[PDB]
DNA sequence: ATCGGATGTATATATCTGACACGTGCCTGGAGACTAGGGAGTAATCCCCTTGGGCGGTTAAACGCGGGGGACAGCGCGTACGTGCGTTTAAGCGGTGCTAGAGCTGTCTACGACCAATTGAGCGGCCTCGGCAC
DNA sequence: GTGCCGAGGCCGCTCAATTGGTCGTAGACAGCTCTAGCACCGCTTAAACGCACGTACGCGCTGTCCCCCGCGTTTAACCGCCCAAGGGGATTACTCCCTAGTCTCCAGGCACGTGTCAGATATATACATCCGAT
């Protein structure tokens, strides 16, 4: 517990392909349009964008909330470092 | 035009762009020249760091991860593009 | 229920790359709670520039303004 | 029908790297890098110029644009290209 | 300035209450910043359709994407109001 | 010779928003809509943070409006403080918070 | 002698702090200090009397915003004291320098 | 010289309570310090930036509101 | 426990500024009326591009089961920071000046927008052939 | 070893950017005036500074237990290959409402010159709360 955890740090670091299954994150995004504007269409490269932002997002939120974990002397990640981490940059 | 001085970029270029934009009413004559020649400096520092981050990968074609990696190494560089993700980049080790 | 079909193998893959070597078994509720703030931040904004145009299609176009109003630029589209 | 900066990097980079080539992806992302440069400095430029009551945009008010858009080290090199352009543009 | 204006709009929702010359500086400054980012806001979504032309659909646009979603939502009916008194009448 | 202003129901001026725009620089032209649209919301706006600030002033058991009850009523409003982020209003001050466990 | 438990006037000053609206510096020093910096970029310059106002001004702000937040990395830690370690943590995070 | 000694122990104590400090360690002060010299270094770079620009002499009052509307950071209450 | 000292804030007397608040005065300046040119805008057409109907196939996700290693609680020690008191600086009120700016106006020479006639510079679309990925 | 393909070359071109010539109006600039800024001096007093005690909060050590990780099997989902006959999206059209110019009487807040508070501040008075000792 706790070995293959750090080949999977390393692998992922080095690779530039995407993490998120593409069907579901387009289902998804259609589903949260509709709330705003009924019978709407997306261009195939609008849903490449929005899901090349909203990776990066949360790879960027994963790593100040574990400077969070560390500076409370642990390892692991809980929510309540994710609350820190997105009340101090502004969310 | 752009021959006189020394430029590889579009003064002509630079100009129609400058005054399409309506930034202010009269456009002097050093000022494309000023623009287009701090363009391409900052063009050739991209490309080179860029070309460095290849070559040391075995590779002689630049990539997005190659730019990703120069950009993110170099400390003036990182603080001008500190918001921007470019598209498959990946991140830092 | 969409939202569910961001599995929890995904969450970890993009800890994983930010770092991180444990996770609690509460962090794939609130991942999922705050990426869909971002998310619908983002597309209100990026309909909202269609609308103005008269299209019905939301562009590749719509998403990266939309993106640059909010302090974050995407090169490359 | 629809103009880009493909030429004149290509150029440059043949300049600095003699043999390294570059993708199509790579090639957006600088196209779009400089795109957002001149953006940058054009805006400005227009506000600047508006700060003080003035209808010209001249080449020392690019100067400044330089001198408040780029970081340290990066601003003292461009600034110098610059002027060097601009002497050899006149004086020729 | 737009002083003048501030001070009748207040005797028409406090018509006892007064105001500093510090207060009545935040304010102007406050109106000031807000005209300038709708009218850049406009002038982006103008720039974007190759358009030479601000219309009253920018604006309303630039309200939209600058405001907060009920406070915009109270404007665009304000301004929709106003220019069909305009108008019609 | 009726201005602007009082075709459209407001008090705002609407013809020096007009040359506001025009002078700036915004685009070639600008439509005849666009000026009273925009003093409509400059107005509403206006209202807005000077009815909030009157109510705070009237808790303080004041009849002036100082920067403190601007600060107030921006920092306790949702939307406001969404608009109204990263804005310093200066000689106001900072909303009491003591933090639930320093108070033993 | 009569004295006060340790931690209840620092909860009275907290009290005052946090009504008041003055300016906390002495005016003598930041002025000496502002031109002391200025003393670099251009030599033999001068400060209109309200420019230094607007700096002390949106210098305390800056100040006064950044500790309310290096006091949530103290909670976080399990703590009531500040270090360091709190006001690294919070400029990091927001990237003030990273 | 030494001047920013001059911002003194019992001012930053000031600070830090009307932030809702309840105790303060012995080295904050030479890292507050230290922190606001990098905020004054940029504005003032900025500021000095824009009188330069107009041909002045004298640092003013909206030199320095333009520069902190630059970097995020929007003042009301000076122009 | 309260209970009663002992230092705090919280209500009520005043004065006392020094301003917010309305008299005036010219400025500009918005409003009104015509004229001109052309940007709206709403037709009418071809399409590329947007969706759903359906197989496969090969992953990847979901479920369950040890079992250890990390979180969290408790306990002890001792060290660094808070409270209060008696000096020691130095900021901050007022008075003198006093040169070094920032602001406005008047005058001419150079410089940039507009417009005609060129022509070689960019594009979009033909084919290879090596280059890194199989 | 094995393909098998995207990057680089070629291209016919046509519409962009160059040269030349005029004109009218910003730049520069020189002169003067009056603010704006800085600096020296003496006095007071409020704040900073040093110091001593003491305590309570940080930090380390130990134990317990629970939940997260690694591995293996089975289910179901995304990515794949092919297709529909929808729509939608950038095209071009005479046509007419609308924009900016150039100008005449009436507008329509900015300055500066005065007073009447009203929220400040200081003295006074209770009414409320930390502290210690039983």
Same mark, same amino acid.
């Given at each position: %517990?706790?070995?293959?955890?750090? =080949? /999977? &740090?390393?692998?992922?670091? *080095?690779?530039?392909?995407?993490?998120?299954?593409?069907? %579901?994150?387009?289902?998804?995004? =259609? /589903? &949260?349009?509709?709330?705003? *504007?009924?019978?709407?269409?997306?261009?195939?490269?609008?849903?490449?964008?929005?899901?090349?932002?909203?990776?990066?997002?949360?790879?960027?939120?994963?790593?100040?909330?574990?400077?969070?974990?560390?500076?409370?002397?642990?390892?692991?990640?809980?929510?309540?470092?994710?609350?820190?981490?997105?009340?101090?940059?502004?969310? | 035009?752009?021959?006189?001085?020394?430029?590889?970029?579009?003064?002509?270029?630079?100009?129609?762009?400058?005054?399409?934009?309506?930034?202010?009413?009269?456009?002097?004559?050093?000022?494309?020249?000023?623009?287009?020649?701090?363009?391409?400096?900052?063009?050739?520092?991209?490309?080179?760091?860029?070309?460095?981050?290849?070559?040391?990968?075995?590779?002689?074609?630049?990539?997005?991860?190659?730019?990703?990696?120069?950009?993110?190494?170099?400390?003036?560089?990182?603080?001008?593009?500190?918001?921007?993700?470019?598209?498959?980049?990946?991140?830092?080790? | 229920?969409?939202?569910?079909?961001?599995?929890?193998?995904?969450?970890?893959?993009?800890?994983?790359?930010?770092?991180?070597?444990?996770?609690?078994?509460?962090?794939?509720?609130?991942?999922?709670?705050?990426?869909?703030?971002?998310?619908?931040?983002?597309?209100?904004?990026?309909?909202?520039?269609?609308?103005?145009?008269?299209?019905?299609?939301?562009?590749?176009?719509?998403?990266?303004?939309?993106?640059?109003?909010?302090?974050?630029?995407?090169?490359?589209? | 029908?629809?103009?880009?900066?493909?030429?004149?990097?290509?150029?440059?980079?043949?300049?600095?790297?003699?043999?390294?080539?570059?993708?199509?992806?790579?090639?957006?992302?600088?196209?779009?890098?400089?795109?957002?440069?001149?953006?940058?400095?054009?805006?400005?430029?227009?506000?600047?110029?508006?700060?003080?009551?003035?209808?010209?945009?001249?080449?020392?008010?690019?100067?400044?644009?330089?001198?408040?858009?780029?970081?340290?080290?990066?601003?003292?090199?461009?600034?110098?290209?610059?002027?060097?352009?601009?002497?050899?543009?006149?004086?020729?």
């Amino acid at each position: %517990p706790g070995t293959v955890a750090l =080949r /999977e &740090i390393r692998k992922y670091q *080095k690779s530039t392909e995407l993490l998120i299954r593409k069907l %579901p994150f387009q289902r998804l995004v =259609r /589903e &949260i349009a509709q709330d705003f *504007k009924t019978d709407l269409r997306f261009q195939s490269s609008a849903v490449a964008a929005l899901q090349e932002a909203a990776e990066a997002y949360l790879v960027g939120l994963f790593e100040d909330t574990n400077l969070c974990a560390i500076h409370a002397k642990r390892v692991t990640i809980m929510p309540k470092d994710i609350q820190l981490a997105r009340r101090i940059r502004g969310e | 035009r752009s021959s006189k001085a020394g430029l590889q970029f579009p003064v002509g270029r630079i100009a129609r762009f400058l005054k399409a934009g309506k930034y202010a009413e009269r456009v002097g004559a050093g000022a494309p020249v000023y623009l287009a020649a701090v363009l391409e400096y900052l063009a050739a520092e991209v490309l080179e760091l860029a070309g460095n981050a290849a070559r040391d990968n075995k590779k002689t074609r630049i990539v997005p991860r190659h730019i990703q990696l120069a950009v993110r190494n170099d400390e003036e560089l990182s603080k001008l593009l500190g918001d921007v993700t470019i598209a498959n980049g990946g991140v830092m080790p | 229920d969409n939202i569910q079909g961001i599995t929890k193998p995904a969450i970890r893959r993009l800890a994983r790359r930010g770092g991180v070597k444990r996770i609690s078994g509460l962090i794939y509720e609130e991942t999922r709670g705050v990426l869909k703030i971002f998310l619908e931040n983002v597309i209100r904004d990026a309909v909202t520039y269609t609308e103005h145009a008269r299209r019905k299609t939301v562009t590749a176009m719509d998403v990266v303004y939309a993106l640059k109003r909010q302090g974050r630029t995407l090169y490359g589209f | 029908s629809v103009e880009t900066y493909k030429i004149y990097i290509f150029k440059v980079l043949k300049q600095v790297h003699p043999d390294i080539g570059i993708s199509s992806k790579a090639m957006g992302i600088m196209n779009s890098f400089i795109n957002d440069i001149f953006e940058k400095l054009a805006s400005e430029s227009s506000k600047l110029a508006r700060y003080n009551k003035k209808p010209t945009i001249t080449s020392r008010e690019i100067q400044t644009a330089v001198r408040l858009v780029l970081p340290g080290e990066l601003a003292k090199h461009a600034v110098s290209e610059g002027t060097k352009a601009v002497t050899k543009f006149t004086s020729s």
